[PDB]
Write a protein that binds this ligand. Sequence first.
Ligand SMILES: NC(=O)c1ncc(N2CCCCC2)nc1Nc1ccc(C2CCNCC2)cc1
Length: 253
Amino acid sequence: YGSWEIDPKDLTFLKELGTGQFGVVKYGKWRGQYDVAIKMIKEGSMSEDEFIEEAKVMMNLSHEKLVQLYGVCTKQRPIFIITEYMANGCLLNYLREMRHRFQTQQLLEMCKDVCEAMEYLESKQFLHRDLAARNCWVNDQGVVKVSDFGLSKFPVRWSPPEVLMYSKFSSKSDIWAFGVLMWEIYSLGKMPYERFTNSETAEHIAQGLRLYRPHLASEKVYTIMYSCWHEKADERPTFKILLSNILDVMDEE
Ligand SMILES: NC(=O)c1ncc(N2CCCCC2)nc1Nc1ccc(C2CCNCC2)cc1
């Protein structure tokens, strides 16, 4: 895999971070110096084809607000995937467990971080398809970054009506999910539509129901997230407009 191939001899394992669909992830060091997350891909947990896929995406997209792949170990089994270390873990857990670290000013900056990542993906004509707090990560500085773009149990609660009825995915379905993610952020990690099932949610949003304004969201912040849920996809903003909107509110906060 060219200069993306890392010598497993240069890795050292320090702490276990947990187990996901594809196996154990550990925190470690690369070449004695760099903090890394090491994903030990469980054999059979994923096909060769599925890995060529993931690798293609990860070595060809790069941005300060996307979790950065550092390399792969493919000359043995199990495969290792080595990525940027996100010391504060998943954003969803962060919102629920680390509330002493942020105020509403920081909640908005979390949204701006994600919005920059998605404006970049939009500029590359690349759809995330599962944007949500569970797929955002927080580093030691509190910076939020997006991961697992295009890796796609269906994320009904983050989906617009045209996805649920027609499988019509576009930049505008990522916009919708981004609105829901801002709702997750300002609700400090509640499940969207927390009293409804998935099936109830799909019927309700088709009939025009929308997520209420979280108490920590100002009217101006709510206007931004609400603009993401226009029933007509072509009336939803772009991520570049959203970013401009968010910066304006941070300047007024
Ligand atoms: N890129 C990364 O840094 C990273 N990638 C994947 C991943 N996963 C994948 C799914 C299985 C769970 C771990 N975890 C990662 N970092 C990570 C970092 C810190 C924690 C702490 C946070 C505080 N409380 C204790 C735990 C947990 C996880």
